Amino acid sequence: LEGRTHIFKIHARSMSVERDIRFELLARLCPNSTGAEIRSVCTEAGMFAIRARRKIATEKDFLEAVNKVIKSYAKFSATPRYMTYN
Amino acid sequence: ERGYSFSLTTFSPSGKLVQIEYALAAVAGGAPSVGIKAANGVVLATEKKQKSILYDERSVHKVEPITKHIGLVYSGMGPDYRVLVHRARKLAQQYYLVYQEPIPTAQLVQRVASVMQEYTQSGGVRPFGVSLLICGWNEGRPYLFQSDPSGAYFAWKATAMGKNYVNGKTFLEKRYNEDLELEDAIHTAILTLKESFEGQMTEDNIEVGICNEAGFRRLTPTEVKDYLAAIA
Amino acid sequence: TGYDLSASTFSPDGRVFQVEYAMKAVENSSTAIGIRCKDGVVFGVEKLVLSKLYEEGSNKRLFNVDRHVGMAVAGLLADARSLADIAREEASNFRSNFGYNIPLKHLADRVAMYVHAYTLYSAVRPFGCSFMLGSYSVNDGAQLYMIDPSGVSYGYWGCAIGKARQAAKTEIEKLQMKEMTCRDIVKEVAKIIYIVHDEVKDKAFELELSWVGELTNGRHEIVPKDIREEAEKYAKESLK
Amino acid sequence: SIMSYNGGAVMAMKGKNCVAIAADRRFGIQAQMVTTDFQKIFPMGDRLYIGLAGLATDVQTVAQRLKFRLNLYELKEGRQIKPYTLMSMVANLLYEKRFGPYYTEPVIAGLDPKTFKPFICSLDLIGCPMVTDDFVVSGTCAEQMYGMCESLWEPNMDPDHLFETISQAMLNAVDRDAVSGMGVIVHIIEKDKITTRTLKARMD
Amino acid sequence: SSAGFDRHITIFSPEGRLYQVEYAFKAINQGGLTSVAVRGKDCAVIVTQKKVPDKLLDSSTVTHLFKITENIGCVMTGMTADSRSQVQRARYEAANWKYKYGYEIPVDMLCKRIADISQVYTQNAEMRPLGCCMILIGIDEEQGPQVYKCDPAGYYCGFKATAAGVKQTESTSFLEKKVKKKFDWTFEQTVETAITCLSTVLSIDFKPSEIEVGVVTVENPKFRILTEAEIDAHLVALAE
Amino acid sequence: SRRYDSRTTIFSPEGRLYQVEYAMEAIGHAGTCLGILANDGVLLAAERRNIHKLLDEVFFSEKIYKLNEDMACSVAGITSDANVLTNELRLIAQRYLLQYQEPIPCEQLVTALCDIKQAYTQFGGKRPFGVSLLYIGWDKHYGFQLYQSDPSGNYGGWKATCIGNNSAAAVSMLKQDYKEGEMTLKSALALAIKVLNKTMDVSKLSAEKVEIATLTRENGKTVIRVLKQKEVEQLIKKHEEEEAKAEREK
Amino acid sequence: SYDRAITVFSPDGHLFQVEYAQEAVKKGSTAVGVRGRDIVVLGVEKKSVAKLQDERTVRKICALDDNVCMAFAGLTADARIVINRARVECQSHRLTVEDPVTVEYITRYIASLKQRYTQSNGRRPFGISALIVGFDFDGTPRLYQTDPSGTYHAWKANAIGRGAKSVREFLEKNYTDEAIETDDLTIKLVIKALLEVVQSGGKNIELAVMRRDQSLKILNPEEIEKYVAEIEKEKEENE
Amino acid sequence: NQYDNDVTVWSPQGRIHQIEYAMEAVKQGSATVGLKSKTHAVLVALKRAQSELAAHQKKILHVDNHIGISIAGLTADARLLCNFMRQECLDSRFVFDRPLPVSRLVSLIGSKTQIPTQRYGRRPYGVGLLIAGYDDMGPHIFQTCPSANYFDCRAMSIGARSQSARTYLERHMSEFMECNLNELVKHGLRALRETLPAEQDLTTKNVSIGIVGKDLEFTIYDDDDVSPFLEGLEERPQ
Amino acid sequence: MATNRIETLDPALIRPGRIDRKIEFPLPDEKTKKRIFQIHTSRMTLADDVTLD
Amino acid sequence: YDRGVNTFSPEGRLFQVEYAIEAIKLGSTAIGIQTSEGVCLAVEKRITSPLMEPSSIEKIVEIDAHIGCAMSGLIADAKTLIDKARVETQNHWFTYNETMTVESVTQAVSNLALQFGEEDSRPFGVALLFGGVDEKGPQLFHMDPSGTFVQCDARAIGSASEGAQSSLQEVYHKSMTLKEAIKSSLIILKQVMEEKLNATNIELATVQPGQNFHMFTKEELEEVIKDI
């Protein structure tokens, strides 16, 4: 749980965001996720900010990023058959 | 018996029943046979080679009656052959219980084909590796019915099954006609059996049964030895 | 690979690897031997103390199936109990139907068929047991049988089941059977079990001896082992 | 008895080259009639009928069961059914209820499907076949119809004398009977055609 | 040519074969044993040696000749558990024949029923196919003696001079070189040829204590197992 | 005992069912039927898969199975599975007649067979029925009908049908020659002759290799006309003369 | 029988076949449905017909009672089975309690069947998603949807089938209370939503309504044509 | 590890690993200790909790007027064998109108747990029974295992880090046989004070004791009638 | 990278950090088909007696 | 690589039950608090769409007239167990004229929390919070898929249970009151939820020895929320 909060602090410390948002709610929606998926969430939230012309993220950008990465590409997701170490 | 009940028979990616194609190949690797319908009777003939000179020819029988007027041979594996023979035996007697009348050969082939098809669907079991040649003289016109492992069946004027069935079939297309007698049927049958067998064909290497409208009759090695004078 | 999995499959050279692996499962158990005399059968089981681990009287491998038949099991233990319960049930059916004591051949054949029937399929595993069966009757004499994990059941004068198997039968074959009463054979098996299976990996061990024959008047019971204490007074004289 | 619950009489008579089957029309509850158009003779294919007599429940039940098995047989085999085959089928269907018996006495009358050979037979309530050459009867008024057919039958009969003989037999044997009356239907069939006539019976 | 699972269960391969039964045909070969049957004029002879390496092992319970019924004997090869289970199936169905049909079962029908049972172990792919070989002998009215064999594949057959086990390519070669040459068949032509064909295949020339001889004759239609004395008589009877 | 299990029921992770489509691609080979309902009657067409010279033709039937008095069905797929289906279907319709003493309407017959097929698609791992098959028939409520069974259990009424993979172009041809109810029984037969002439690549359509059966409406008979070969021959001659008349436009 | 468990949990906490059998719903035809306050309306889009054949057998909207109505998505055969069992259940409820069958009961039955169907030994889960619209006692219009998981779940307008995200986004910017004021406007609202969905040629637009004191009326596709025509007229009046 | 999937598969070393895995499932319970005198049998367990606010998962449960069991591992299989235990007790209590001796009951437990350890598609029961009882011939302290190889002992201890408990029991097994209830029970919980790290022990919050006596019915105690038993102790060494 | 099927891939390539965008290409509609037929007939002497619909 | 579903682990646990304990975590949160005045309870609905009619989502369902409940994660596996638990409580009051206590209810449920198998299928996927007022005062009870049933004084479950348990142990003690615990729960709720806390998000369920039945209609929730 707290690992993903800290990895959000890692990928978020040097990027243009709105610091008034939280990060714990973002971590609570990523139960089985890797740091790579976290990185994709951060970058894709930035890419949704590039759809408009802004200089700061919104919470809704990160929610778009979560439902863009996790729930959509969770059909591939790389770890339902490596957690069993096949 | 355990709770599995799952069919091991699966279609291919293309759509093909690989275990039935393999069962047809296992039929094709068996002993050859030929059977000919010729206006008054039907002749069946097999090719029964002992492996050594030690074996006896009075124990195992290829030509086998199902009722008093219905003969039946195969081209495949005897161990499955006897099982489905026994099934056909038990099945014909229920018809004769119900209707008090000897079963027609088409009705036999319907029910046996239903059994074999229903068994290849059934779970955890392999198909039979047996192709039949069923015949009989029901209601004047005699018949001849070939089945296969896939459950299907046909109706032939003359056919063959086993090794070199293609060569025997190309001999049958040229040789047979519409009208013959039983003796000429035996003549062309031993000719096409002599097409593929070894050189020494005696009263025991072949085994021949006929059908009359007066009933089924299974010929003896006596008349088989009588026949191969001026052979084929 | 692939051919060691099921108990139904054969090998490219024609044997069942499940049955072999189950045979060498019993190979790690303790050495338990048996031998008959001209009027009885004597059993004996090496039981090992580690330090405490129990009380002088648990899990005794010398079972007692019928009034005149008992087991001398070795191998996986719970499977041996289930097999003993099946054997008690079978002797019960025989006593209930035909009205007399079970002959040891029929008992061994029924048990062998059950063990063999558990080897035929993929739903069940083969047994991990190998056990002994002794008896005595006034019209039958002494009979000693032996059932492997596969189900091969035939008769012996002497046998051995466990780790030390040849080295326990090296001196079974130096005894004889016609000239012995079983009261010598008690201390003979006792002194040899104390001889075999040295102190090296296990430190303390403990002896059990079952005992059937004419001297028990057809009964089967454990020896009064504390009475006459016949092992140890010769076993400590067996070290030189 | 249970056979005398609803009355009933079925007569079949073999002629020279043809066969005639007749039955009564009355339906009712032991002394109370209900209708005059109750069907007891059923068509089973062409030129082959069956008659059913006794308790009406088993009449309609066995008729529908037999029609079930009959259509299954004629669809499993493209030919139409021989009469001995039908007799054996009715015998097996009745004998399946050996201890749960139907109360009926089926009468089969039909021609040969290959030749013009006639055929008659009757069965009992457990499945006992009986082939004869002259006539079979079934129902309450047995002895009346026995007296008529053993009195009036000739071996070689043109269909007109066949019709008049079975007419007089049914009329007189029914008029002596009490619980069975109220009209007669007569089926006179042959190789070429099928004729159905109704007689002027006493409506009492 | 193998596809999928066709090396583990009984299915069809691309070459068309099934591999379980053609592994079962050398499941016989781990027995290390040889069997020879002979049928002559009005007798029939079984011969089979025994392999007892142990002095502690008995001699009575090593018997392979199993008297199935009062006119039917048999011998077994292959693994022992399959053999004995096959024997109890044979005994049970012969007794069922005697109950249902009244008269004594002919040796043909017994082989047919056993072959069909073996087919049921073969036909379904979720039971192991019993890797043992079965030899039958018997007397029939109006036909004299018979000798039949039942295989694990389920093909019964039966013939004049019959042999299966370990070394029987050579045994059937010698029996082609011996029964095709017009020999007559006495009680001692059959017995002498039975002991000597195995005595030339194995080349041992041994004691009367290794082979077992089961005979049946139309003077005594009971199945009969010979004693060491008359075995010794035949053995010195072939000593020119 | 589970590593041998073939899993012919669990969805595939592409998104569809797996074994179902391969049963469909098993439908696609060995078979080519259609019928033309466009008033007073309905017909069926069929191709001989075993047109070899050494058969008997003694069955007085072929691909058609007169399953009742007023319904038949054309088969395509593996034959003997369909025999299992025709036996069960015939018995279903006959038990309905046993239950009501009124003939069986064609859609509850179709849905009964569709529930049987879906019953083996849904649960167990059993092999699905690789048979699609047609339906012609009559009722009290709509007249002449046509239905298309599928191995999934899905069905669907048509006015011009199709099973086999050779006959998708036939559906294209049926649309390009679509009529609004014009089956004088010579127009529809000539159209069917034209379709089977074009779609099968058998040059000039030998009449032994084809099969046509019709179903007309009679008051007390409801005859099913499994017609003989001579009218097929003169139908082929009629159509080849009309193709010669049609190519005078070039 | 078939002693096996088809649907196993995932290593990360899923049911593969429940979440994955939603994809079969996701690749089926689209169907919307709203409730007005007095007239209920629903209909399916994308019949994707051959335009030249029968259409009385491909009807995707049926009824279980004279009070309740259907719709579904996914594959049609599982819908056929579930509808047969639902008809049996609603009529058996009428056997007992003498009311007309409440819609909430039949949705609980369908979802309960679906869940005990996914739970059981080796039964493949139902890849459908139904819509159950009815107006029980005292005229209250309600509408529920199903799911392969088996969660009856009351909505106010529909979003299933192909591209349901787009359709719900149009219903999102079209949640006007004004739209459910005029029954005709509610019908036109379904037509406009389905027009903001697929081709909507006025051919695959199969719609059926119920005015809650009658039975279901399937509309003849000339009235729907005039509905689309007046929708296009209002769209021209927007400029 | 293609032999490590099922119960049916023998290993090529003969060790069927489903039983070993069930053993390791027993090893992950709480610590517990059972030990007998000549006249009294005492089993003592240790409770644990999921969090601070929640209560502690109880271990000692009742079976019969003279039989009580300890437990370690899973709780569903625990209650399953528990229900079977009460049922088999009250069956003979019904039929023979006598109390059951413990040894035949534990033989029935082994015969019960054999079948899910041999067929295919059943698990071995993860269970950690320590059984104390009274037949006519005095106290018995049995333990089970998922391999159904039940033992009779004089003192066992199963659960997490239970081996130090066995070391304490060895250097006092001579002293155990003579003493009365009080110092016996406090020897059992001195086994428990060495099954723990040296700074949190048994402050009336985690221990339970079940005594059966020749006149005493089997009775469980928890923290409050254990507060009399917890005094009479000294500290741990340096 | 471009594939036909994706389910037969080893998912270790398909994790993010390697590949971030996964894009579906469906069979489009019956509207952009008009653009496809239009552009693939944009450079030809189309006889106007045909309809692309 | 598909093994048998009734396989333990190399480490010891199982597999499928552990995967069920993982499958809890995606569900919505819930918070129940035992107080001697009575048991209070709270939950989040997780409203997704405005088309989604809000009063139809059930989280607190009713077992008895005095035994409450709340579910999590999968809804419908919970619905089966709720129905059956009701049936067995009705059997107890019938054959005993008395109230089946909450511990006996949960023993009856976790008797078949794991009867999953191929003969005589999967493990269930729901965490449950059980309350009510028996003779032993108020009771709050928590089970799991593994049947490992324990009493909890104030347990928080599901997706936000880490900070819920932590910040709950911050505020909780033994002598709390009712309304203080209610607002103490919903403060934690609107720290752990994602949407704005309003009239439609959450729902309460309180059962008391005085307030005899669990009764909680709408718009006293409004009065409770405007008290923040």
Pairing of strands F224-226, C74-75: unpaired
Which residue is closest to H147 within chain C, CA to CA? C78
Among the partner-chain residues H51, H83, H123, the one whose CB lies closest to the CB of J6 is H123
Other beta carbons less than 10 A from residue A5's beta carbon:
15
Question: Which residues fall within 8 angstroms of residue C117, CB to CB, at 6 or more apart?
Answer: E85
Per DSSP, J123 falls in state P
The beta-carbon contacts of D91-96 under 8 Å, at least 24 apart in sequence, are D91/B100, D91/D123, D91/D127, D91/D128, D91/D129, D92/B97, D92/B98, D92/D127, D93/D62, D93/D65, D93/D66, D93/D69, D93/D127, D94/D62, D94/D123, D94/D125, D94/D126, D94/D127, D95/D126, D95/D127
* Domain boundaries, position H135: 1-238
Angle at B110 between CA B104 and CA B112, to 5 degrees: 100
Residue G74 near residue G83 (C-beta atoms within 8 A): no
Contacts of C121 in chain B (CB under 8 A): 2
Q: CA separation (Å) from D5 to D35, D104, D139?
A: 15, 12, 11
To the nearest whole Å, the CA of H109 is away from the closest chain J CA by 19
Per DSSP, C142 falls in state E
Tell me if B99 and D89 make a contact (CB, 8 A cut-off). yes
The tokens for G213 are: 């004191």
Cα–Cα dist B182/B184, whole Å:
6
The partner residues of H142 in beta bridges, in order of sequence, read: H131, H152
Q: CA separation (Å) from J97 to J91, J100, J101?
A: 10, 9, 13
To the nearest whole Å, the CA of C123 is away from the closest chain B CA by 7
Other beta carbons less than 10 A from residue J120's beta carbon:
6
Which amino acid is residue E228, in one-letter code?
E
Helix (H, G, I), strand (E, B) or coil at E234: helix
**F122 and chain B: CB distance < 8 Å anywhere?**
no
- How many domains would you assign to chain H? 1
Residue J153 near residue J34 (C-beta atoms within 8 A): yes
DSSP string, F58-119: TTS-SS-EE-SSSEEE-EEE-HHHHHHHHHHHHHHHHHHHHHHSSPPPHHHHHHHHHHHHHH
Residue J167 near residue J191 (C-beta atoms within 8 A): yes
To the nearest whole Å, the CA of D178 is away from the closest chain B CA by 38
Per DSSP, D80 falls in state P
To the nearest whole Å, the CA of B199 is away from the closest chain F CA by 29
To the nearest whole Å, the CA of E22 is away from the closest chain C CA by 9
The tokens for H98 are: 């006598």
Cα–Cα dist J56/J5, whole Å:
35
Which residue is closest to F12 within chain I, CA to CA? I7
Cα–Cα dist H23/E116, whole Å:
46
Q: For chain C, list the domains and their CATH numbers.
A: 1-240 (3.60.20.10)
Q: For chain D, list the domains and their CATH numbers.
A: 1-204 (3.60.20.10)
Q: In B, what residues contact G, Cβ < 8 A?
A: 2-6
Residue F18 near residue F152 (C-beta atoms within 8 A): no
At least 3 CB pairs under 8 A between chains H and D:
no
Chains within contact range of chain B (3+ C-beta pairs < 8 Å)? C, D, E, F, G
Tell me if H55 and J152 make a contact (CB, 8 A cut-off). yes
The partner residues of E75 in beta bridges, in order of sequence, read: E135
- Helix/strand/coil (H/E/C) assignment for every residue in F32-63: CCECECCCCCEEEEEECCCCCCCECCCCCCCC
Residue E140 near residue E158 (C-beta atoms within 8 A): no
User: Residue C218, exposed/middle/buried by CB under 10 A (0-12, 13-18, 19+)?
Assistant: middle
Residue J180 near residue J36 (C-beta atoms within 8 A): no
Chain H 149-188, CB below 8 Å of chain C: which residues?
149-155, 166, 169-170, 173
Q: CA separation (Å) from J123 to F92, G7, J33?
A: 40, 10, 28
From the list H148, H42, H156, the residue with the least C-alpha distance to C54 is: H156
Resolution (A): 3.6
Cα–Cα dist G102/G216, whole Å:
17
Helix (H, G, I), strand (E, B) or coil at A43: helix
CATH number, domain with residue B215: 3.60.20.10
Pairing of strands C158-161, D135-139: unpaired
Tell me if A81 and G11 make a contact (CB, 8 A cut-off). yes
From the list F167, F165, F191, the residue with the least C-alpha distance to F178 is: F191
Contacts of B122 in chain G (CB under 8 A): none
* H/E segment holding residue C238: none
Cα–Cα dist C78/C64, whole Å:
15
From the list E44, E6, E48, the residue with the least C-alpha distance to E220 is: E44
Residue D182 near residue D33 (C-beta atoms within 8 A): yes
- How many domains would you assign to chain F? 1
Helix count and strand count (H, E) for chain C:
5, 11
Chains within contact range of chain G (3+ C-beta pairs < 8 Å)? A, B, F, J
Tell me if J76 and G114 make a contact (CB, 8 A cut-off). yes
Which amino acid is residue C84, in one-letter code?
A
- Helix/strand/coil (H/E/C) assignment for every residue in H60-72: CEECCCCCEEECC
Q: What is the CATH number of domain J1-228?
A: 3.60.20.10
The tokens for C70 are: 């008992």
| % helix, strand, coil for chain H, step of 5 | 30, 20, 50
The partner residues of C142 in beta bridges, in order of sequence, read: C136
Q: Looking up tokens 């009680």, which residue turns up?
A: E187
Cα–Cα dist G159/J51, whole Å:
9
Q: Of F10, F11, F12, F14, which to mutate for an interface test with I (greatest number of I Cβ within 10 Å)?
A: F14
Tell me if B114 and F54 make a contact (CB, 8 A cut-off). no
Dihedral, CA of residue B27, residue B28, residue B31 and residue B36, to nearest 10? 90
Q: How many beta-carbon contacts under 8 Å exist across B and F?
A: 104
Cα–Cα dist G44/G32, whole Å:
6
Break positions in chain F: residue before each gap, C to N over 2.5 angstroms: none
From the list D53, D52, D62, the residue with the least C-alpha distance to D6 is: D53
Tell me if J1 and A32 make a contact (CB, 8 A cut-off). no
Q: For chain E, list the domains and their CATH numbers.
A: 1-240 (3.60.20.10)
Q: Of E6, E8, E89, which to mutate for an interface test with C (greatest number of C Cβ within 10 Å)?
A: E8
Pairing of strands J202-204, J38-44: antiparallel
The edge-to-edge listing of strands for the beta sheet with G68-69 is G68-69, G131-135, G141-145, G153-154
* Domain boundaries, position F139: 1-250
From the list D32, D80, D90, D34, the residue with the least C-alpha distance to D58 is: D90
User: Residue C236, exposed/middle/buried by CB under 10 A (0-12, 13-18, 19+)?
Assistant: exposed
H116: left (phi over 0), alpha (psi -120 to 50) or beta: alpha
Among the partner-chain residues J1, J22, J162, the one whose CB lies closest to the CB of A1 is J162
Residue F108 near residue F71 (C-beta atoms within 8 A): no
The tokens for C110 are: 């029924």
Contacts of G121 in chain B (CB under 8 A): none
Alpha helices in J51-101 (DSSP H): 76-96
Q: CA separation (Å) from C60 to C130, E108, H137?
A: 15, 51, 18
Phi, psi at residue F77, to the nearest 5°? 125, -160
Residue D87 near residue D122 (C-beta atoms within 8 A): no
Residue D33 near residue D17 (C-beta atoms within 8 A): no
**F1 and chain C: CB distance < 8 Å anywhere?**
yes
Q: Looking up tokens 């749960």, which residue turns up?
A: D100
Cα–Cα dist C220/C63, whole Å:
10
Tell me if E172 and B54 make a contact (CB, 8 A cut-off). yes
Cα–Cα dist H45/H56, whole Å:
12
**Distance between start and end Cα atoms, chain I:** 34
Q: Looking up tokens 């009777």, which residue turns up?
A: B41
Q: For chain G, list the domains and their CATH numbers.
A: 1-239 (3.60.20.10)
To the nearest whole Å, the CA of F124 is away from the closest chain E CA by 17
Cα F89 to chain centroid distance, Å, stands at 15
Tell me if D71 and F94 make a contact (CB, 8 A cut-off). yes
**I5 and chain F: CB distance < 8 Å anywhere?**
yes
Contacts of C6 in chain E (CB under 8 A): 8
Per DSSP, C63 falls in state -
Other beta carbons less than 10 A from residue B60's beta carbon:
17
**E183 and chain B: CB distance < 8 Å anywhere?**
no
The tokens for H96 are: 């023979």
Angle at E27 between CA E24 and CA E28, to 5 degrees: 115
CATH number, domain with residue F127: 3.60.20.10
Which residue is closest to E124 within chain B, CA to CA? B125
Tell me if F94 and D65 make a contact (CB, 8 A cut-off). no
Q: Looking up tokens 């031997």, which residue turns up?
A: C33
Angle at G135 between CA G133 and CA G139, to 5 degrees: 155
From the list B150, B124, B117, B114, the residue with the least C-alpha distance to B7 is: B124
Experimentally, the structure was elucidated by cryo-EM
Cα A63 to chain centroid distance, Å, stands at 8
- How many domains would you assign to chain B? 1
Among the partner-chain residues J107, J110, J155, the one whose CB lies closest to the CB of H54 is J155
Residue G148 near residue G18 (C-beta atoms within 8 A): yes
**Distance between start and end Cα atoms, chain F:** 70
Q: CA separation (Å) from B20 to A71, B38, B118?
A: 44, 32, 13
The tokens for D113 are: 């499907």
Angle at B177 between CA B173 and CA B183, to 5 degrees: 110
The tokens for B16 are: 């093909």
The tokens for F70 are: 């007023």
**F127 and chain B: CB distance < 8 Å anywhere?**
yes
Residue J141 near residue J85 (C-beta atoms within 8 A): no
CATH number, domain with residue H6: 3.60.20.10
